[PDB]
Paper text:
However, exceptionally high-level aminoglycoside-resistance is achieved by the action of intrinsic and acquired 16S ribosomal RNA ([name]) methyltransferase enzymes in aminoglycoside-producing and human pathogenic bacteria, respectively.
To assess the relative contributions of these two interactions to the observed β6/7 linker structure, individual D21A and [name] substitutions were created for further functional and structural analyses. In contrast, substitution of the universally conserved W203 to alanine resulted in complete loss of resistance, consistent with previous analyses of equivalent substitutions in KamB and NpmA. Critically, in terms of β6/7 linker structure and dynamics in solution, the intensity of cleavage at R206 (bands c and d) is increased upon [name], W203F or R43A/R73A substitution, consistent with increased flexibility in the absence of the R43/W203/R73 double cation–π interaction to stabilize the β6/7 linker conformation.
Residue numbers in the entry: 5 to 192, 212 to 227
Write the structure that this text describes.
Amino acid sequence: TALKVLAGKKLTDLDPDEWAKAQASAERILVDVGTGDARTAYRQAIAHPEWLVVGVDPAWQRMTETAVRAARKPAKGGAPNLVLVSSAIETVPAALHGVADEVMVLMPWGKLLRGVVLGEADVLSGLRAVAKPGAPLEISIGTSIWREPIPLEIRDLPELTPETVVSTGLTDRLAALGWQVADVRLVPTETVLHLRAVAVDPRD
């Protein structure tokens, strides 16, 4: 019920009332699903102190170094608006339901990457669950991963292009789970596939 949040190197139960207070005080709430070492989320947190930047990742021990520098005083690189949550997107806590003004999936790997490419329901629904209505979903995937050697988790999958996003039915599956595709574009450095969706009612 309380979020399992990082406090430096240790894991912590975040006080449900403090969690609500932080959201209210924030002008915008941004959720980074799949953070890695979460230093991208940290840079965002430092760049936008009025934003509540929530980093979500199951591998919480890789975020610890960032969590340490974030826990410091403001004069030494502290980011009190950064919240690193230990969780998978497939099984998100109820405290994370509908909290996001924006959901980002930047350079995913493993199940998150494969889930996004294939359009797995458990992943897409988990992404949808944390978003407020009208919230944008940003997915960024570097297309260099389909060069050899190709990572195992997308090894059997054809390269994701704007045309394949449609032809594979990924767009349909996003639509059936509450995500309305707004834009898809290749951006070259390495080409980066950008997908933009908006949180809506699940149709088909």
